[PDB]
């Protein structure tokens, strides 16, 4: 879906001349009765490789943050800023611990959805590596609800679609596990 | 007996493929992979002695909405649409470097001057008849006399 | 009960709520007039052309130049062209001036 | 120097990919009518051009600047809007339809979710070049031209976009790049064969070519829209008929033969392990293989739009409108409606992933 | 600097001068193409295509018709206008494009806020598909009942026998 | 310069121009739609405008297939 | 009622176009054989002593 | 719209201006003025007058009448009953 | 009535056989887009024989817990 909107940058520069668009800035942060957070810091790549594990962490703060927005009946962006920080605080946590148990695997799962076009069906090699290391070291598991254990995608063996082009050091990492740890 | 001669004009067609195919791949990919360097050209041209071999970002494709909201996310954090970074924390700077597009709502110029479109009994009312614009100024003229109470 | 102002992916658009509301009043047996409604509809038309607060926005900008005040210091601060959204406008530690690449993402 | 040349090429940089993207599909061109002749000369027991350049590879050279050497006949030089403007949409149509090619994964000019729309109606703005010519001319074999120009579009737009459709529907995407992925499992040359011969029939009368070549028939119409025109005119209209033709047999790769995929995916594989992926050596070879995979699913065709002409006589154009409205169109309605039939059946619904 | 101005002042600069058949249905073409191009940007791809897909078609169906038709009429027909006259008409015309008199409206400038609620996201098209097919079913349905009609009427009107 | 009927001097005087001139008008509408749509973000307007192009096909249709049987009575006699 | 073929069988033939692929075959034949063309004028076709040219 | 708007005045006023135009004996041309006797005209210049009439009025005498015409009466006549405008395209009727 | 052309309601078998013979663009176009139809129709077999549809996708926004929300939750605050 690549239509245009007046909410976020439009496909070319000629959009932007007919629209006239002006990107406007605002120097002023929150007021000081709203305690301060610190915001996420992670790209695109990044966010996609721990979204599973984020959830997996932050399941309940996640659901109270939304079911606030419910019960708030419009009133949504207002009431539940406190419900919002503890999601940032959490998912931060979890990117905290995967640059301190998981560097390697992690650097290896993102990097290799950058070089796929950030398709999950193109990296299987670097992300049961990193789903090994997770579970070894911070007790979370990759779930994909409403189905059987048994029947998740990633979890397939024979997939019937699969990367055109092999990641190098997805590959070879993947060999370094396979004769070692499976001795 | 295979004709050599009348598959050179076919080879040279293959490498005309190939001419567009190994420029495009390498020529695209390169430069993405530079600009998510760094917000600075002195990281984008020069390497650093202690960095790593270098990971390359393939041309992103199939896009939508989110991944535009993305693209300015990144912006804000790396300094490129494709930027890299899997910090924990960011930066104060991406509390307030927030970018918000302000555009115009006005019809298009084919609609207000082809010289048979703009022509309706309603665009005519509009252009020229004052009594929609009388009757909706009363709504703005409410807001402020109903300030004072 | 049809469906009316749907959003380009399928759900409710940004101007549904003000219109559901209008709905639910009018049709409520409680009311005996639609008085109590009137205010609901104008929310519903200030969604769609904000022409009140456009409306706003022309009485400060007005008032602004009679008392002399420059519009660039008490405005805010904004880029006309995209590939000039720099890290240094964005403000980055090492932020530098150079164009950003908006070719091809 | 120095720094402000390292970033003026960066500046630069993208304006350079495109100028390589015009010079690659040109040379293509270029050469196909030079492959055409040869080609046809073998199985015609000739040999085809041999004698302009070292074994005939300047033959495409030195027929181009030739004719924009040459005088360009019109009733007054102002009148050079008459004959250029039909010959400058038609040339523009197709140029802008090679937009959404993608020669890899992204390696296309223009993503968009409407690529297929965008293709068709690139393509038939095309045909509003070619009517332009007949404008109240005075030429008895170029009025002649029009007319069954219009015709066989009636013919084969309803066939062609329609099959394209099908495709589309099968992936549930109308995204030329997304319809190239999912064939990585099976070529839609297989489940679609009566599709790809019937899309194969529709390029061949959407580009004039033989056997419905009703438009400049030589025997008929002695150049059809053509016969009043000379040098650059000439050259746009050839250039435009026969970078269609690439066009055409670049879109057969495309939708039944998995576009760039390789043949094998061991050989690829094992080709590009021996370059490193630090390295851009690697992005070099990928792009000339990705590429010429297409390449050789495109020269197949382009091979086999020589191979008609030289094997098969001339249809009327009365008798290709009954063709298409009797057979083509009732068969490609019915495959519209058997494929969701299948695909409800067994919970195979297509999505975008 | 809006280009779309100038393209415009030449498309009506020929409509007052269009004398022969061939001449309005080219100034036809020369309205579909600036109001496709807009349409491409600012506000809507998808029917900038669905433009082009439609109408060129047409077009030709309409210009073949030309065809059968012209009958020398306006190949001598002598026609005065004067080129003083066509620019002070084409210039009064240029005074005034304001379509609308809210001043507030045209010289504000509105921004949205996206959100991130919307995780399934699919084209337009696919939206439009989605409610044609299944809340407004009976127009699509009808639609084709014209169709049907159209097909008929052409028959009955056309055919000598 | 609109309330002066300017645009019936851009009409040419052919009665296929009159057609070419309702296509306009018609498009002019559609045109409208479209932008009242996407401002909105209303995917029921997006149907409207779908709709109005798929009518305004089949009124060009029906009027051109009468204006070829007019021309078609005209030059009916076909002795030869 | 008195065809040989069946109508599947007609109707195969008819719609694979089975004599067009025939006839393409039969080209491509050519194409793996030896032509007939000689490099004149380094090459010189047949002449008999009974030929007439210049006088 | 396609009916004829000739009257026997006009028709006998554009038919002596026509026939002035030539070589006759007489400039005094009313109904009964003869081709043969009072204008003088032989085989040949009594078949360019018909012909040149035949211009002005965009009328064809058949080849009964014009061998049998005698008198400047029966070319009015002629005219009068035989003329009719020449069918126009369909944009200049319904326009 | 060696080719006569046969009455439908009497000789149906015979009647589509003079369509096969005669009009091969108007059999074989109508037995394709059949199928299409008829493989709808068998859809329940392949429900009980061969396997069950997949779950629905959550293309529905975010999934809400149908529960209150939990009071008694802490944790990461200010
Ligand atoms: C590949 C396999 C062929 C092979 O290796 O040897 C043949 C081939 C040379 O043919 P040849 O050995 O001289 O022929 C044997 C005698 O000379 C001459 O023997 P012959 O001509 O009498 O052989 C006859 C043979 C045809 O000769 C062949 O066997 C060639 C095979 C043709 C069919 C496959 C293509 O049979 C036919 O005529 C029927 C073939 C056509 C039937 C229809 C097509 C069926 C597919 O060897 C090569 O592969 C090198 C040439 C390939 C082109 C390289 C340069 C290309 C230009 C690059 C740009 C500069
Ligand atoms: C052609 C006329 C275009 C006039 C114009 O305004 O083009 C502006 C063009 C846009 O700048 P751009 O090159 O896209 O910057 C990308 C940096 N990554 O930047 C330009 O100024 C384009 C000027 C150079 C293009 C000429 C062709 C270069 C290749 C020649 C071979
Ligand atoms: C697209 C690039 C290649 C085409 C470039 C040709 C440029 C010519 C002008 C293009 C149309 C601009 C808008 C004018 C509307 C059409 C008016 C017209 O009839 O064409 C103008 C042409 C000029 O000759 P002229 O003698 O001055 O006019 C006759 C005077 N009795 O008089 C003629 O009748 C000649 C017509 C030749 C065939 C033109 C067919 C229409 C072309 C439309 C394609 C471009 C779409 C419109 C783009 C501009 C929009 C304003
Ligand atoms: C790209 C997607 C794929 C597109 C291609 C799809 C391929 C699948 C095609 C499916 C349709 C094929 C139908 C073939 C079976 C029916 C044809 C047939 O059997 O013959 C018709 C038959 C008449 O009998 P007859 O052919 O005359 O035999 C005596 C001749 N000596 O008539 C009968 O007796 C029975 C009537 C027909 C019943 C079956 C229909
Ligand atoms: C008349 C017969 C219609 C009944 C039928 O053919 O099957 C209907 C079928 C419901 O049966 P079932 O598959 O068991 O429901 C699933 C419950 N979990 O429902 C289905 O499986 C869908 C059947 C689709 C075909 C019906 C329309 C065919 C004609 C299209 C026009
Ligand atoms: C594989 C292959 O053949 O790739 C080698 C290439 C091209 O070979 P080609 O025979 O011209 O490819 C044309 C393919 N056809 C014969 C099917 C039309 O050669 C080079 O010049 C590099
Ligand atoms: C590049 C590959 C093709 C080169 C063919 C070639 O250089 O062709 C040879 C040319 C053209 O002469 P010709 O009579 O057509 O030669 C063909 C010989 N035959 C007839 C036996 C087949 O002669 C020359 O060198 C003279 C000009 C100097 C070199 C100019 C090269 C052309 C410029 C564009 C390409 C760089
Ligand atoms: C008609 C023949 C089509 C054809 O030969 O193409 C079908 C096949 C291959 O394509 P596939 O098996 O359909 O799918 C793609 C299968 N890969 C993954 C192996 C590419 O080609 C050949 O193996 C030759
Ligand atoms: C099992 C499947 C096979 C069933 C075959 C039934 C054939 C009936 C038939 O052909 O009916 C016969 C009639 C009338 O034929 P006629 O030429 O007027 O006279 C018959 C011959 N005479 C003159 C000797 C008597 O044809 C029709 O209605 C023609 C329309 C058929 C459909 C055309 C569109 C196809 C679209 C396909 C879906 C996308
Ligand atoms: C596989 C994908 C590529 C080929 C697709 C098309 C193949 C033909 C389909 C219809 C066949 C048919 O209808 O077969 C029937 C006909 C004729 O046989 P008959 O008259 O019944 O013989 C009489 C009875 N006998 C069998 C007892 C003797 O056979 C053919 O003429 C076969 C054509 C073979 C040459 C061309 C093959 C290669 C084509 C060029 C490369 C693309
Ligand atoms: C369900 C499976 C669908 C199959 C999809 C493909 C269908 C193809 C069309 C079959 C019908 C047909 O070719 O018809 C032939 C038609 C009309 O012939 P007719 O007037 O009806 O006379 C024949 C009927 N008789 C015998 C009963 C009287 O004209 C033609 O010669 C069209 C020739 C087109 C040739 C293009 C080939 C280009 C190369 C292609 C290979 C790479």
């Known amino acids: ?183 | 007996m295979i004709p050599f001669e009348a598959l050179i004009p076919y080879a040279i067609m293959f490498a005309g493929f190939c001419l567009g195919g190994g420029v495009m791949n390498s020529a695209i990919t390169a430069d993405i992979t530079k600009r998510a360097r760094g917000p600075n050209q002195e990281i984008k041209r020069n390497v650093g002695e202690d960095e790593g071999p270098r990971n390359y970002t393939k041309p992103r494709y199939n896009t939508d909405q989110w991944d535009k909201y993305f693209a300015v996310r990144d912006l804000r954090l790396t300094g490129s649409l494709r930027g890299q970074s899997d910090n924990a924390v960011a930066e104060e700077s991406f509390k307030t470097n927030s970018i918000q597009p302000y555009s115009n709502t006005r019809r298009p110029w084919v609609l207000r001057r082809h010289i048979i479109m703009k022509n309706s009994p309603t665009k005519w009312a509009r252009k020229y008849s004052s009594r929609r614009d009388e009757r909706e100024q009363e709504i703005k003229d409410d807001y402020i006399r109903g300030m004072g109470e | 009960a049809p469906l009316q102002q749907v959003g380009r992916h399928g759900g409710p658009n940004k101007c549904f709520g003000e219109f559901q509301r209008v709905v639910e009043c009018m049709t409520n047996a409680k009311h005996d007039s639609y008085e109590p409604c009137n205010n609901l509809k104008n929310d519903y038309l200030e969604c769609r052309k904000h022409k009140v607060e456009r409306y706003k926005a022309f009485l400060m900008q007005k008032h602004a130049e009679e008392l002399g005040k420059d519009p660039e210091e008490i405005g805010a601060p904004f880029v006309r062209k995209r590939r000039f959204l720099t890290s240094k406008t964005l403000g980055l530690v090492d932020g530098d001036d150079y164009e950003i690449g908006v070719e091809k993402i | 120097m120095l720094n402000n040349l390292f970033d003026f090429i960066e500046y630069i940089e993208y304006w350079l990919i495109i100028v390589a993207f015009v010079a690659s599909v040109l040379i293509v061109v270029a050469y196909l009518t030079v492959a055409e002749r040869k080609t046809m000369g073998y199985m015609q027991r000739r040999l085809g051009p041999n004698a302009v350049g070292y074994y005939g590879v300047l033959m495409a050279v030195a027929d181009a600047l030739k004719l924009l050497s040459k005088e360009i006949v019109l009733p007054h030089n102002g009148d050079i809007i008459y004959v250029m403007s039909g010959p400058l949409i038609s040339l523009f149509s197709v140029l802008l339809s090679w937009a959404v090619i993608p020669f890899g994964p992204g390696l296309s000019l223009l993503d968009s979710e409407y690529s297929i729309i965008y293709l068709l109606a690139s393509g038939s703005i095309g045909v509003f070049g070619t009517v332009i010519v007949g404008w109240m001319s005075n030429s008895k074999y170029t009025v002649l031209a029009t007319v069954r120009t219009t015709a066989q579009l009636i013919s084969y737009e309803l066939v062609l976009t329609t099959v394209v459709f099908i495709i589309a529907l099968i992936v549930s995407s109308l995204n030329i790049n997304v319809i190239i992925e999912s064939q990585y499992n099976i070529w839609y040359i297989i489940p679609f064969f009566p599709l790809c011969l019937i899309f194969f029939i529709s390029a061949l009368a959407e580009t004039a070519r033989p056997p419905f070549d009703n438009v400049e028939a030589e025997s008929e119409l002695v150049s059809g829209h053509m016969t009043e025109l000379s040098a650059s005119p000439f050259v746009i209209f050839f250039l435009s008929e026969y970078c269609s033709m690439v066009l055409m047999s670049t879109l057969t790769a495309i939708f039944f033969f998995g576009g760039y995929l390789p043949f094998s995916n061991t050989i690829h594989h094992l080709i590009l392990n021996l370059f490193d992926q630090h390295s851009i050596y690697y992005f070099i070879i990928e792009g000339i293989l990705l590429s010429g995979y297409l390449a050789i699913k495109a020269n197949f065709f382009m091979f086999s739009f020589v191979w008609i002409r030289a094997a098969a006589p001339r249809l009327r154009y009365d008798l290709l409108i009954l063709f298409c409205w009797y057979v083509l169109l009732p068969i490609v309605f019915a495959i519209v409606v058997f494929a969701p039939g299948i695909l409800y059946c067994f919970d195979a619904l297509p999505v975008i992933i | 600097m809006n280009l779309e101005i100038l393209d415009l002042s030449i498309l009506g600069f020929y409509s007052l001068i269009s004398s022969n058949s061939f001449e309005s249905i080219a100034i036809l073409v020369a309205t579909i193409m600036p109001v496709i191009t807009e349409l491409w940007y600012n506000y809507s791809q998808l029917f900038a295509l669905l433009y082009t897909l439609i109408y060129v078609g047409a077009v030709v169906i309409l210009f073949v018709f030309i065809l059968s038709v012209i009958n020398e009429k306006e190949e001598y027909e002598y026609e005065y206008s004067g080129l003083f006259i066509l620019i002070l008409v084409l210039l009064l015309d240029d005074l005034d494009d304001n379509e609308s008199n809210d001043n507030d409206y045209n010289n504000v400038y509105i921004t949205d806020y996206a959100d991130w609620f919307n995780n399934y996201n699919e084209s337009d098209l696919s939206v439009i598909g989605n409610l044609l097919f299944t809340e407004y079913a009976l127009l699509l349905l009808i639609i084709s009942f014209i169709l049907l009609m159209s097909i008929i009427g052409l028959i009955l009107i056309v055919k000598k026998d | 310069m609109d309330l002066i009927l300017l645009m019936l001097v851009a009409v040419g005087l052919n009665i296929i121009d009159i057609y070419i001139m309702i296509e306009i008008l018609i498009m002019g509408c559609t045109v409208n739609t479209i932008y009242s749509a996407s401002l909105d973000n209303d995917m029921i307007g997006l149907i409207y405008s779908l709709i109005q192009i798929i009518i305004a096909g089949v009124e060009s249709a029906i009027g051109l297939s009468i204006l070829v049987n007019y021309n078609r009575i005209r030059n009916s006699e076909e002795i030869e | 009622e008195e065809s040989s073929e069946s109508a599947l069988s007609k109707a195969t033939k008819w719609y694979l176009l089975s004599e067009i692929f025939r006839g393409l075959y039969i080209t491509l034949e050519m194409y793996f054989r030896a032509p007939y063309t000689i490099y004149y004028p380094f090459e010189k076709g047949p002449v008999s002593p009974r030929f007439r040219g210049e006088h | 719209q396609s009916a004829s708007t000739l009257t026997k005045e006009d028709v006998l006023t554009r038919s002596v201006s026509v026939l002035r135009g030539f070589e006759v004996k007489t400039k005094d041309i009313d109904l009964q003025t003869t081709f043969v006797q009072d204008l003088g005209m032989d085989s040949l210049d009594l078949n360019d007058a018909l012909v040149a009439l035949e211009e002005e009025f965009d009328v064809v005498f058949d080849d009964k009448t014009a061998n049998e015409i005698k008198t400047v009466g029966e070319v009015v006549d002629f005219v009068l009953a035989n003329y009719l405008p020449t069918e126009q395209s369909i944009n200049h009727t319904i326009r | 009535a060696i080719g006569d052309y046969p009455v439908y309601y009497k000789q149906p078998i015979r009647w589509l056989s003079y369509h096969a013979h005669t009009r091969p663009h108007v059999f074989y176009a109508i037995a394709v887009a059949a199928l299409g139809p008829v493989f709808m129709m068998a859809t329940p077999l392949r429900r009980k024989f061969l396997y069950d549809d997949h779950e629905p996708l959550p293309a529905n926004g975010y999934p809400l817990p149908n529960r209150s929300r939990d009071k008694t939750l802490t944790g990461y605050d200010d």
Not at chain 1, 7 to 13: I, Q
């Open chain 1, 1 to 183: 879906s690549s239509t245009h909107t007046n909410d976020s940058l439009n496909s070319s520069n000629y959009v932007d001349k007919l629209k006239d668009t002006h990107f406007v800035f605002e120097n002023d942060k929150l007021p000081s009765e709203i305690p301060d957070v610190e915001e996420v810091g992670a790209t695109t790549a990044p966010l996609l490789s721990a979204a599973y594990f984020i959830g997996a962490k932050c399941q309940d703060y996640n659901d109270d943050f939304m079911l606030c927005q419910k019960e708030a009946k419009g009133n949504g962006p207002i009431d539940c800023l406190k419900e919002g920080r503890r999601v940032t605080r959490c998912a931060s946590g979890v990117l905290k611990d995967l640059n301190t148990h998981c560097s390697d695997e992690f650097r290896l799962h993102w990097q290799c959805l950058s070089f796929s076009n950030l398709e999950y069906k193109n990296c299987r090699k670097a992300e049961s590596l990193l789903n090994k290391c997770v579970f070894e070291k911070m007790n979370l598991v990759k779930k994909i609800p409403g189905i059987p254990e048994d029947r998740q995608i990633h979890l397939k063996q024979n997939p019937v679609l699969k990367p055109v082009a092999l990641h190098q050091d997805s590959e070879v990492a993947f060999k370094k596990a396979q004769n070692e740890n499976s001795i």
